Amino acid sequence: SENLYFQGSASATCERCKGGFAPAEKIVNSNGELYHEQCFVCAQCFQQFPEGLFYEFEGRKYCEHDFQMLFA
Amino acid sequence: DIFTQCREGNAVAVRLWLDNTENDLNQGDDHGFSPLHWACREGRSAVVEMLIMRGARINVMNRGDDTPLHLAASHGHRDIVQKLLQYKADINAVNEHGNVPLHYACFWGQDQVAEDLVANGALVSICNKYGEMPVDKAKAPLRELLRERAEKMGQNLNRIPYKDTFWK
Ligand SMILES: [Zn+2]
Ligand SMILES: [Zn+2]
């Protein structure tokens, strides 16, 4: 994933929370999906993914630690 | 198995399994999810009521120290949250990250669950282990509303840093 500074469409929405972005806002693009910085985080701990690595379980994204604890 | 039947809401199969008292209705699966955890997570209201009325322990914890009330709140199952509270679930139960059920209701925009939790006294100012209060996981409108509701319910809004018996 990569950090971007938003200057895109008014229709653009965060993949997680469905809210919009402000001009100039630092956001994350992961595989074409756009996220608020506070939204590209593990669903269990709410912290950033170490080295950007996440693991999906039923439509939510988890860090390695929480994925291994709960779902692996 | 029982865990799949609870996830799916197969009430007759769950009832028959519970009828055999040699089965342990509190026993967790490979990650510590009890029948009650799965039924709460997946919104299976009839199965939740059956498990509770047949004696299931309400504050059981899975491998990440989540309770059934964390899962019901995280997944927006309002009726199940109310049933659990009625049967004495610990509303400020903490998981391994110091998160309470209100953190998840706020993070996932489960607005009616978050409001019900605060109406039942859930603390809004208690930081998790990384310094984040539950209401600060919410989007602004809900965040502001929950602090106002909490104040009107006689909460103190001072930030409370995380502490537990093993912290220091
Ligand atoms: Zn977002
Ligand atoms: Zn995590």
UniProtKB/Swiss-Prot annotation, chain A:
Organism whose genome encodes this protein: Homo sapiens
Physiological role: Within the IPP (ILK-PINCH-PARVIN) complex, binds to F-actin, promoting F-actin bundling, a process required to generate force for actin cytoskeleton reorganization and subsequent dynamic cell adhesion events such as cell spreading and migration.
Subcellular location as annotated: Cell junction, Focal adhesion; Cell membrane
Tissue specificity field: Expressed in most tissues except in the brain.
Quaternary organization: Component of the heterotrimeric IPP (ILK-PINCH-PARVIN) complex composed of ILK, LIMS1/PINCH and PARVA; the complex binds to F-actin via the C-terminal tail of LIMS1 and the N-terminal region of PARVA, promoting F-actin filament bundling. Formation of the IPP complex is dependent on protein kinase C and precedes integrin-mediated cell adhesion and spreading. Competes with LIMS2 for interaction with ILK. Interacts (via LIM zinc-binding 5) with TGFB1I1. Interacts with SH3/SH2 adapter NCK2, thereby linking the complex to cell surface receptors.
Domain LIM zinc-binding: 14-66
This protein's name: LIM and senescent cell antigen-like-containing domain protein 1
Swiss-Prot record, chain B:
Protein location: Cell junction, Focal adhesion; Cell membrane; Cell projection, Lamellipodium; Cytoplasm, Myofibril, Sarcomere
Posttranslational modification: Phosphorylation by PAK1 modulates ILK subcellular location by promoting its nuclear export.
Expressed in which tissues: Highly expressed in heart followed by skeletal muscle, pancreas and kidney. Weakly expressed in placenta, lung and liver.
ANK repeat ranges, renumbered to this chain: 1-28, 29-61, 62-94, 95-127, 128-168
Region of interest: Interaction with LIMS1: 31-137
Function description: Scaffold protein which mediates protein-protein interactions during a range of cellular events including focal adhesion assembly, cell adhesion and cell migration. Regulates integrin-mediated signal transduction by contributing to inside-out integrin activation.
Subunit structure comment from the entry: Component of the heterotrimeric IPP (ILK-PINCH-PARVIN) complex composed of ILK, LIMS1/PINCH and PARVA; the complex binds to F-actin via the C-terminal tail of LIMS1 and the N-terminal region of PARVA, promoting F-actin filament bundling. Formation of the IPP complex is dependent on protein kinase C and precedes integrin-mediated cell adhesion and spreading. ILK also interacts with LIMS2/PINCH2 and with PARVB and PARVG which may substitute for LIMS1 and PARVA in the IPP complex; PARVA and PARVB compete for the same binding site.
Family: Belongs to the protein kinase superfamily. TKL Ser/Thr protein kinase family.
Domain comment in the entry: The kinase domain is likely to have lost catalytic activity but retains ATP-binding activity. ATP structurally stabilizes the kinase domain and promotes stability of binding to PARVA as well as focal adhesion stability. The PH-like region is not required for assembly of the IPP complex or for localization of ILK to focal adhesions.
Protein name, as recorded: Scaffold protein ILK
Provenance organism: Homo sapiens (Human)
Taxonomic lineage: Eukaryota, Metazoa, Chordata, Craniata, Vertebrata
Part of the full-length chain shown: 3 to 170 of 452
